[PDB]
Amino acid sequence: AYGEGANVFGRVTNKSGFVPYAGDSFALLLPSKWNPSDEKEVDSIVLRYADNFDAVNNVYVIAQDTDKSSIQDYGSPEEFISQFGYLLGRQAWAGQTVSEGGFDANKVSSAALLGVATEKDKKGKTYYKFEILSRTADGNEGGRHQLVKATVSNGKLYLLKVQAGDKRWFKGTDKECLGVLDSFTVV
Amino acid sequence: MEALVYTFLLIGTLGIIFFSIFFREPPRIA
Amino acid sequence: LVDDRMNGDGTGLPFGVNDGILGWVIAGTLGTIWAIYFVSQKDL
Amino acid sequence: LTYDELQGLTYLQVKGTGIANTCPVVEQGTSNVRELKPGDYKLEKFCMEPTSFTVKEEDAKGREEFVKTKLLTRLTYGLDGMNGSMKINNDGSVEFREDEGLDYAATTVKLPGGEYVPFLFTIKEFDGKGTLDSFSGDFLVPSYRGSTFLDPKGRGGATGYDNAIALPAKADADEIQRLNNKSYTPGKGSAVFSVAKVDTETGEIAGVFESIQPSDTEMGAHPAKDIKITGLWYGQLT
Amino acid sequence: GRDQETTGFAWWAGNARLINLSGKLLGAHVAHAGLIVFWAGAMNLFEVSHFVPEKPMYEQGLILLPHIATLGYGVGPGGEVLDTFPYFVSGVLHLISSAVLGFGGVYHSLIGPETLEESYPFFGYVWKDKNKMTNILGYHLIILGCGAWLLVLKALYFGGVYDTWAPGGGDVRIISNPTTNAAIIFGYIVKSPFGGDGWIVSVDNLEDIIGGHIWIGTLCILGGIWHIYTTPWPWARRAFVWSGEAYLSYSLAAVSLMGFTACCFAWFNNTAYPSEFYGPTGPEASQAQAFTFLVRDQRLGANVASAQGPTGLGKYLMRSPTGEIIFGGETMRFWDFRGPWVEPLRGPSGLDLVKLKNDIQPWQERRAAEYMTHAPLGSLNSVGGVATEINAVNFVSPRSWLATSHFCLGFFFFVGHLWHAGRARAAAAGFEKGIDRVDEPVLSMRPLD
Amino acid sequence: LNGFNFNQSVVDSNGRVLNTWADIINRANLGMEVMHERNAHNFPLDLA
Amino acid sequence: VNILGLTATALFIIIPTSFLLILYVKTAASE
Amino acid sequence: MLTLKIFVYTVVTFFVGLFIFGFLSNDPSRNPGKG
Amino acid sequence: LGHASFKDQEGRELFVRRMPTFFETFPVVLIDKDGVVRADVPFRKAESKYSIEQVGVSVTFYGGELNGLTFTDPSTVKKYARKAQLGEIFEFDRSTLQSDGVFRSSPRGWFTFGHLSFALLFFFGHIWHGSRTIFRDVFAGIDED
Amino acid sequence: SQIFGVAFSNKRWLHFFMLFVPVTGLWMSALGVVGLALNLRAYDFVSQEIRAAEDPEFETFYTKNILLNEGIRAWMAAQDQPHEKLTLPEEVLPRGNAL
Amino acid sequence: KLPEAYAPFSPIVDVLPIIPVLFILLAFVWQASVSFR
Amino acid sequence: VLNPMWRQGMFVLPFLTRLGVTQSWGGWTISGETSSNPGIWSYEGAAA
Ligand code: CLA
Ligand code: CLA
Ligand code: CLA
Ligand code: CLA
Ligand code: CLA
Ligand SMILES: CCCCCCCCCCCCCCCCCC(=O)OC[C@H](CO)OC(=O)CCCCCCCCCCCCCCCCC
Ligand SMILES: CC1=C(/C=C/C(C)=C/C=C/C(C)=C/C=C/C=C(C)/C=C/C=C(C)/C=C/C2=C(C)CCCC2(C)C)C(C)(C)CCC1
Ligand SMILES: CC1=C(/C=C/C(C)=C/C=C/C(C)=C/C=C/C=C(C)/C=C/C=C(C)/C=C/C2=C(C)CCCC2(C)C)C(C)(C)CCC1
Ligand code: OEX
Ligand SMILES: [Cl-]
Ligand SMILES: [Cl-]
Ligand code: NA
C-alpha cells in the first residue's frame, strides 16, 4: 500500500486512442482498447491482439523464417498473396452446393482484393500492403476485411494482418484499423 | 394421446370457471 | 394466376370497400339502426 | 393485358392489385407461328406465369396421379426479367438458352391431407431443343435451402453442429441422414414449352408451357415429389 | 388564491379550484401559452446555438430546426443549410411573444378580475351556457382555419415549402395547383390505418398536403361561423355532458388521438418529415441497407437476381405477397416503403431489374449509404445502433425521439381523458364524493347481482 | 429507443477496455442476438 | 413417460377431487 | 370470401351502430343519483 | 472402450476439454499441453483453420474394448472426441430400458433435493407453529379494548 | 360480480387472499431455485426434443428458446467464467446467418 | 452557431430550456410557501 | 384390403361409413381413394 494522491483538475493522460508496443524487432501502434490473447492462431505468431467483444477484430504478426533476400524477389503483390491463402482459413466442408449463389461451383467462400500498396522505407525496402474483402455464404456480418502488410528483415518474415468486420468497418473502427496498419514499423 | 389429456384438462378448468361464475353461493345481505 | 383473390390490400381503398354493395349495406344497416332509434323517440 | 400498357401504369396503379404477377398477353398478332423470322436471336425480358400446380401423390390403391393443391404462399411465384438467346432454323428447329434473371421462386402448396410441399419453381439453365410448336429440355434445380441454412437443432451443411446435441447419448445412431450427412446436391427438372400468338412487328411471342420438377428434399431427407406445373409464358426478341 | 376549506380541493388538485373562477382560469391558460411559446423560443435558440454547418440536422439532436426547414427556410436543393437567420428570427420572436403572454398570464393570475361575467359579458361564461361555449369554439375554429390558410399562403406565394420528391435530391419548391379534389382529400381520412394504407400518415406529396390544408382551413372557418351563429341541438344536449371538466375530457381524447397520429407521422411519413432533415425512417434505413448491399455486390461483379438466401428466397430481390419485386431479406417487411431514392429505380413491376442494374445515381448511392449509417437505432444514452453495439457513435434519430415522446404523451392524455370523462359524468350525477350511505343504489336492487 | 448502453464505459489510463457487468449483459445479449432468427438475416446490421 | 404420466395425472385429479367433494357434500348436507 | 366479407361488414356496422345510437339515446340520464 | 489419446499431425498431443457441469451443450475443442487451443469441431467451419479435417487429428485407444486401434477418419474422430468430452468413453446398451438419451440424477441428488425442499417447508412450519404458540390468545382476533 | 362474474364478499378472506398470493408465489420460486441449486432443471421436453431431432420440419418457440439458451451459454461463458480458462475461438461459437 | 453579435449571449441561451421545469418546481415552492393551504 | 378397419378394432367408423361418411380431413377415403375435397361431413367433421 503506497500513499499517493488521486487525479483531479490536472488534464487527461491519454486521449489519442492508441498505444505503442515494442516486440521482436517491430514497432507499431496497437489499438489501445484491444485486449491481448494467448491463442496462437498460427504456429509462428509473436504478438496477437483482439477486440474485447468480438475476435473478428484481431491483429497479429507472423515470424516465418525466410530463404529469400527480399519480398520484391517474390514478385507481384498478386503472386505474393497467392502464396498465403491459408491465412484466411481453408473451407472445412467437402459437401457440394451451388444452391447458395454469389460464389462459384461447390465454393461458398471468396476473397476479393480492393487494391495493393508499396511503401518504400528510408533507403530501399518496400512494404506490401493490401486489403482483402473475405466474404462468406451466409454473409456473416457482411464478411471480413483482411489488411495484410509484409516486409522482411534479416530473415523472420514479419507480416501484419489486421482482421476486421464489415459492420465494424463502417460503424467506427476503420480509422483505428488504418492507424494500426500504417504504423507497422520494422526497424 | 397427449393432446387428448391437455384438451380435457383445459376444458375441465373452463368448466370449473363456468360453474364458479354462474353457480356460486349467493351472498346474503344479512 | 392459380387462385382467385380480392387483392384489396393497399390502393387507399375507402372503408375497405371494393364493391359498392359493401358501402350500400354499411349505409343501410346504420340506416336501419337509425330508423328504429328515430321512431323509438319521445320516450323515457 | 399487353406489354404496352403494363409499362404505361405507374407503381401505385398496380400496387396491391395483383397485376405485377401477370405476364403480358399479346392481344394483336397471329396464330400461324411459322412466320417467325429465323436467325441469331438474343431474347430479353422473358416472362413466366403458372396457372395450376399439381403434385404426384401416392395412394394405397396404387393409382399414381397428380392432385390439385392449395397455394399456401401468396402471389410470389411468377418469374420475370429472364434473359438468354435462342436460334430459329429453316425447318423450325429451335434451341433455347436461358442464363440470367429472376428465374426461380420458392413456392409452397398443400396436398389434400394438410402436408406442406415446398418446391422451388425454377426454370434456370434451360436447354429447350425442339420445334416451334413444342420444344422441351432439362433445367437445373437447386435443392431449396443452401448449405449455410441450419435446422431447428443447429446442424445443416455449412453452418451448424452436425449433431443433435440436445441429447448427449444419441450422437451416433440411425438418424444418419438427419445429422451425420446433409445433402444439397442440385437436381434436374423437365419442362415442355409451346409457342402461340407470335408478333413479328415488335418481336414478341407468347405461348403456354408445361414443367415437371421435384420439390425440396429437406436437405437429404424424406423423398421429394414431382411437381407438374402448367401456365403461360411471354417473351421478346433482341 | 384560496385554501382547501374554501374550495374542498387540495393543493395536488389546486387548479380544480379555478374551474368556476373564469379570470384566473384565463390567466392560467395564457400563462401556459406563454410557457409553450417560451419553450419554442428557448429551444429554437438553443438549437441554433448548438448547430454545426457540416453535419445534417438529424445528427445533432435537432427537433425544431427540421420543422422550420420543412417549411422552406434556410434550405435549398438537397437540404444543405444556406442560413440560420430565419431560425434565429423564429426563436427570438417566440421568446419575446412569450414574454408578452407571460405578462398577461401573471396579470390575470395575480391581480386580474376574479370573474369576467359581471363586467365583460363578451368574455365571461358559465359552463352550462351552450350558446357561449359554441361561440368560443367558433372563435377558436376561425383561428385554426386562419392558421391552416397561413400554411397554404406560405406554400403558394411565400417561398414555397420543401419537397423531397422533386428531382435532384429535393428542394424548396412553390406549390402550384394543389389537389382540391374532395375524393382525394377524404379518401385519406376514410382510409384504413393498416399496412399499405396507413390512414393519413401515407400522404406522400405536397400537392395533397396543401390541398388537404385548403380543405381543413375552409371547413374550419365554416364551422366557426356555424358555431357562433347556432346553438347545440337537443340530440347533442342529450348525448353530451355540459360541464367544464367534460369539455376538458373531450379535448383530452381528441389531443390523445392527435398525439398518437403525430407519433405515426414522425415514424413513417417522409414528405411532411423530409428524410434529409429528420433522418431516415425505419423502413427507409432497412431498404437503404438492402439497396447499398445490392450495389456493393454488383460492383464486386456478382449477380443479383440469382443468389438466393439460406432459405431459398432471394438475398437481394424477392416478390412481395402481391407480386411486384421488392428487396430481399427481412427488409421485405418494409416493402411498403416509398422514398425519393427508390422511385427513379422503381417501375410497374416493382423494382425494375435493368433499371436497378444500370440506372444507379451517385447521390442516390450516397443517400443510401448514409441512411444505413444513421439508422433510427439507439439507446437512452444516445448511443447509436442496436443495444449490443459499442459506445463510439453519439446518435439517436429525431424520429425515434419524437415518436417515443409523443406516444407516451398520447397515452397519458388518453388516460387523462378517462379520468376527466369519469369525473365529469360523476360530478354531473352527484357521485364525485362517494355513495350517499342511506340512498345507496345497490340496496334498492334485487340480490343475485 | 432501447435500454441503457454502458458498454466500454470504463477504460483505464492507457485506453484498455475493462469488462463490466454491463459487458457481461452485452455478451449474453449477443448470444440472444445471433441465434434469434438464425436464417432470416442476410445482412450484418439488424436494422429491420 | 406416456402411460405412467397419464395414470399420475388421473390420480392427481381424482384423489384430491374426491377429498374436497367429501368435504363439500358433507358441508352442504348440513343445510 | 366476398360473401363472408359482406357478412362480417354488416355484423360490425350493425353492432357499432347499436353502440353509437345507444350512447346517443340519452346516456347521462342513466344514473341512479340526483343530478 | 478405452482411454482415447488424440494426436495432431506434427507430433503434439491434443486433449479434449472436459465438460463443465453447468453446460448442457458444450463445444468440442482439443488443446495442447501448454494451454493453447489447437483443434476443434467448428460450428461455422467457414474461413477456419482449426477444424479436424485440416489439423489432422488421429485417435488411439489404450486398455479398453479397443486396444491399440488408431482411427484417422474425421467422422469417427469427431464422435470419439464428443464422447471424450463427457470423460471416459463408454459403450451403453441403450435398448434394454428404451433409454431416451438425456442424463439423470443420483440417489444422492434426489435425496438432497427432497430434503432441502422439505427443509424450507419445515422452516415455514416452524415459524407458523412458534407464531401460534407465542400468539395463542389472539388466534380468534384481538381483545377489542 | 357483474363485471368479472365472481367477486369477494368477505373482507377477511379478501385480505387473507392478498396475504396468501405473494407468499405462495415466492415460496414456489424458492423451491424451484433449490431445485436449480442441484442443476435439477426443467430444461427439456424429451418427447419434443426427440421429435425435433428426428424431424427438421418440426420448429416451435420452445426449440427457438433452446437455441437461444445455447447461444447465451456459449457467448457468455468465456467472459463470465474466467476460472474455467475457456478460450473458445471465434471459430466454434454458434452463429446464425448474417448478423 | 449563433450570429456573431449573439456569440457572447450563447451561454445565457444555453440555460433557457430549463425554465419550464423551474416553473413547475416554482409552483411547488409557492405551495410550500403558503404551507399547502 | 389387408388391414381393413374391422381388423383395427374400429367400432364407430363402420357406423359413419354405412350411412355415407367415407372421406376424411386427412386426405384419404377408406374405400381406397384420395379425398381432394372432403367437405364438412367427413369423419372429423361429424365428430366435431
Ligand atoms: C402551467 C402551470 C400553472 C399555472 C399557470 C397555474 C396558475 C394558477 N394557479 Mg396553480 N398549480 C400548479 C400549476 C400552475 N398553476 C401546480 C403544478 C400545482 C401543484 C403544486 C398548483 C397548485 C395550485 C393551488 C393549490 C392553487 C393554484 C392556484 C392558481 C391560480 C392563482 C395563483 C395565485 O395567484 O396565487 C399567488 C401566487 C404567487 C404570488 C406567486 C406567483 C409569482 C409569479 C407569478 C411566479 C412566476 C414569475 C414569472 C417568472 C414572472 C413573469 C412576468 C412576465 C412579465 C414575464 C393561477 C391562475 C390557486 C387557485 O386555484 O386560485 C383560487 C390555488 O390556490 N395552483
Ligand atoms: C412536454 C410537452 C411537449 C413538448 C415539448 C412538445 C414538443 C413538440 N411537439 Mg407536442 N404535444 C404534446 C406535448 C409536447 N409537445 C402533448 C401533451 C400532446 C397531446 C398528446 C402533443 C401533441 C402533438 C402533436 C399532434 C404534434 C406535436 C408536435 C411537436 C413538435 C413540434 C411542435 C409544433 O410545431 O406544433 C405546432 C405549433 C402550432 C400548431 C401553433 C401554431 C403555429 C402556426 C399555426 C404555424 C405557422 C407557420 C406558418 C406556415 C409560417 C409562415 C408565416 C407566413 C409567411 C405565412 C415539438 C418538438 C408535432 C410533431 O412534430 O409531431 C411529432 C405534431 O404534429 N405534439
Ligand atoms: C391539458 C390537460 C389537462 C388539464 C387541463 C387537466 C386539468 C386538471 N386536472 Mg388532470 N390529468 C391530465 C390532463 C389534464 N388535466 C392527464 C394527461 C392525466 C394523466 C392520467 C391527468 C390526471 C389527473 C388526476 C389524477 C387528477 C387530475 C386533476 C385535475 C384538476 C386539478 C389539477 C391539479 O392542479 O393538480 C396538481 C398538479 C400537480 C400536483 C403536478 C403533477 C406533477 C406530475 C406528477 C409530474 C409529471 C411531470 C413528468 C415530466 C411527466 C412525464 C411523463 C411523460 C411525459 C414521460 C384540473 C382541472 C385532479 C382532479 O381530478 O381534480 C378535479 C386529479 O385528481 N388530473
Ligand atoms: C426423500 C423422498 C424421496 C426421494 C429422494 C426419492 C428418490 C427417487 N425415487 Mg422415490 N418415492 C418416494 C420418495 C422419494 N423418492 C416415496 C415416498 C414413494 C412412495 C410413493 C416413492 C416411490 C418411488 C417409485 C415407485 C419409484 C421411485 C423412484 C426414485 C428414483 C428416481 C427419481 C424420481 O424419483 O423421479 C422423479 C421425481 C419427480 C418428477 C418428482 C416431481 C417433483 C415435484 C414433487 C413435483 C410434483 C408436485 C406437483 C403438485 C405434482 C403434480 C403433477 C401431476 C399433474 C401429475 C429416485 C432416486 C423410481 C426408481 O428409480 O425406481 C427404483 C421409482 O420407480 N420412488
Ligand atoms: C340431427 C342430429 C344428429 C345427426 C344428424 C346424427 C348423425 C349420426 N349419428 Mg348421432 N346422435 C345425436 C344426433 C344426431 N346424430 C344425438 C342428439 C345423440 C345423443 C343421444 C346421438 C348419439 C349418437 C351415437 C352414440 C352414435 C351416433 C352415430 C351417428 C352417425 C351414424 C348414425 C347411425 O349410426 O345410424 C343408425 C341409427 C339408428 C339405428 C337409430 C334407429 C332409431 C330406432 C330404430 C327407432 C326405434 C324407435 C322408434 C321411436 C319407433 C318408430 C315408430 C315408427 C312406426 C315410426 C351419424 C353421422 C353413431 C356413430 O357413428 O358414432 C359417431 C353412434 O355411435 N349418434
Ligand atoms: C359507405 C357509406 C357509410 C358512411 C357512413 C357516413 C354516411 C354519412 C352520414 C353523415 C351524417 C352525420 C350524422 C350527424 C348527426 C347524427 C346524430 C343523429 O342521428 O341525431 C338523431 C336525430 C334525432 O331526432 O335525428 C336527426 O337529426 C336526423 C339524422 C341525420 C342523419 C342522416 C342519415 C342519412 C340517411 C340515413 C340512412 C339512409 C337510410 C336507409 C336505410 C333505412 C332502411 C332501408
Ligand atoms: C401564475 C402562477 C404561476 C406561474 C405561471 C407562468 C407560466 C408564468 C409565466 C411567464 C412567462 C411565460 C415568462 C416568460 C418570459 C420571457 C422573458 C422574460 C423574455 C425575454 C427576453 C430577452 C431579454 C431575450 C434576449 C435575447 C435575445 C433577444 C435573443 C438573443 C439572446 C438573448 C437571450 C440575450 C406558477 C405556476 C408559478 C404558480 C401558480 C401561479
Ligand atoms: C390537412 C391534411 C389533410 C386533410 C385532412 C382533413 C380534411 C382532415 C379532417 C377530418 C375530419 C372531418 C374529421 C372528423 C372527425 C371526427 C371525429 C374523429 C369524431 C368524433 C366523435 C365520436 C367518437 C363520437 C362519439 C359519440 C357517439 C358515437 C354517439 C354518442 C355521442 C358520443 C360523443 C359519445 C390530408 C390528410 C388530406 C393530407 C395531409 C394534410
Ligand atoms: O422478429 Mn424477432 O428480432 Ca425485432 O429485430 Mn428485426 O425483427 Mn426480428 O430481427 Mn431483430
Ligand atoms: Cl428465435
Ligand atoms: Cl437482416
Ligand atoms: Na439470421
Automatic annotation (TrEMBL), chain F:
Entry binding sites for [CaMn4O5] cluster: 36-37, 46, 48
Post-translational note: C-terminally processed by CtpA; processing is essential to allow assembly of the oxygen-evolving complex and thus photosynthetic growth.
Subcellular localization(s) per the UniProt record: Membrane; Plastid, Chloroplast thylakoid membrane
Stated family: Belongs to the reaction center PufL/M/PsbA/D family.
Other remarks in the entry: 2 of the reaction center chlorophylls (ChlD1 and ChlD2) are entirely coordinated by water.
Job description of the protein: This is one of the two reaction center proteins of photosystem II. Photosystem II (PSII) is a light-driven water:plastoquinone oxidoreductase that uses light energy to abstract electrons from H(2)O, generating O(2) and a proton gradient subsequently used for ATP formation. It consists of a core antenna complex that captures photons, and an electron transfer chain that converts photonic excitation into a charge separation. The D1/D2 (PsbA/PsbD) reaction center heterodimer binds P680, the primary electron donor of PSII as well as several subsequent electron acceptors.
Quaternary organization: PSII is composed of 1 copy each of membrane proteins PsbA, PsbB, PsbC, PsbD, PsbE, PsbF, PsbH, PsbI, PsbJ, PsbK, PsbL, PsbM, PsbT, PsbX, PsbY, PsbZ, Psb30/Ycf12, at least 3 peripheral proteins of the oxygen-evolving complex and a large number of cofactors. It forms dimeric complexes.
Protein name from the UniProt record: Photosystem II protein D1
Residue span relative to the full protein: 297 to 344 of 353
From TrEMBL, chain H:
Keyword rRNA-binding: no
Pfam families given in the database record: PsbI
Keywords (A to Z) from UniProt: Chloroplast, Membrane, Photosynthesis, Photosystem II, Plastid, Reaction center, Thylakoid, Transmembrane, Transmembrane helix
Cellular component, GO, one term: chloroplast thylakoid membrane
Entry membrane topology: Single-pass membrane protein
GO biological process: photosynthesis
InterPro entries: PSII_PsbI, PSII_PsbI_sf
Main location: membrane
Compartments in which it is found: Membrane; Plastid, Chloroplast thylakoid membrane
Residue intervals passing through the bilayer: 6-24
Top-level taxonomic group: Eukaryota
Entry function: One of the components of the core complex of photosystem II (PSII), required for its stability and/or assembly. PSII is a light-driven water:plastoquinone oxidoreductase that uses light energy to abstract electrons from H(2)O, generating O(2) and a proton gradient subsequently used for ATP formation. It consists of a core antenna complex that captures photons, and an electron transfer chain that converts photonic excitation into a charge separation.
HAMAP family per UniProt: PSII_PsbI
Protein family: Belongs to the PsbI family.
Assembly and oligomerization: PSII is composed of 1 copy each of membrane proteins PsbA, PsbB, PsbC, PsbD, PsbE, PsbF, PsbH, PsbI, PsbJ, PsbK, PsbL, PsbM, PsbT, PsbX, PsbY, PsbZ, Psb30/Ycf12, at least 3 peripheral proteins of the oxygen-evolving complex and a large number of cofactors. It forms dimeric complexes.
UniProt-recorded name of the protein: Photosystem II reaction center protein I
Source organism (scientific name): Dunaliella salina (Green alga)
Automatic annotation (TrEMBL), chain J:
Coiled coil: none
Subcellular location: Membrane; Plastid, Chloroplast thylakoid membrane
Highest taxon above the source species: Eukaryota
Residues binding Fe(2+) 2, per UniProt: 15
Positions annotated to bind a plastoquinone: 8
Binding-site list for Fe(2+) 1: 15
Transmembrane region(s): 13-38
Binding site for Fe cation: 15
Extra information: 2 of the reaction center chlorophylls (ChlD1 and ChlD2) are entirely coordinated by water.
Main function: Photosystem II (PSII) is a light-driven water:plastoquinone oxidoreductase that uses light energy to abstract electrons from H(2)O, generating O(2) and a proton gradient subsequently used for ATP formation. It consists of a core antenna complex that captures photons, and an electron transfer chain that converts photonic excitation into a charge separation. The D1/D2 (PsbA/PsbD) reaction center heterodimer binds P680, the primary electron donor of PSII as well as several subsequent electron acceptors. D2 is needed for assembly of a stable PSII complex.
Family, as annotated: Belongs to the reaction center PufL/M/PsbA/D family.
Subunit structure of this chain's protein: PSII is composed of 1 copy each of membrane proteins PsbA, PsbB, PsbC, PsbD, PsbE, PsbF, PsbH, PsbI, PsbJ, PsbK, PsbL, PsbM, PsbT, PsbX, PsbY, PsbZ, Psb30/Ycf12, at least 3 peripheral proteins of the oxygen-evolving complex and a large number of cofactors. It forms dimeric complexes.
Protein name: Photosystem II D2 protein
Source organism per UniProt: Dunaliella salina (Green alga)
Gene field: psbD
Residues of the full protein shown: 254 to 352 of 352
Automatic annotation (TrEMBL), chain L:
Subunit structure as annotated in this protein's UniProt entry: PSII is composed of 1 copy each of membrane proteins PsbA, PsbB, PsbC, PsbD, PsbE, PsbF, PsbH, PsbI, PsbJ, PsbK, PsbL, PsbM, PsbT, PsbX, PsbY, PsbZ, Psb30/Ycf12, at least 3 peripheral proteins of the oxygen-evolving complex and a large number of cofactors. It forms dimeric complexes.
Protein family (similarity comment): Belongs to the PsbB/PsbC family. PsbB subfamily.
Protein source organism: Dunaliella salina
Protein name: Photosystem II CP47 reaction center protein
Subcellular location: Membrane; Plastid, Chloroplast thylakoid membrane
Annotated function: One of the components of the core complex of photosystem II (PSII). It binds chlorophyll and helps catalyze the primary light-induced photochemical processes of PSII. PSII is a light-driven water:plastoquinone oxidoreductase, using light energy to abstract electrons from H(2)O, generating O(2) and a proton gradient subsequently used for ATP formation.
Gene encoding the protein: psbB
Binding site for chlorophyll a 4: 18
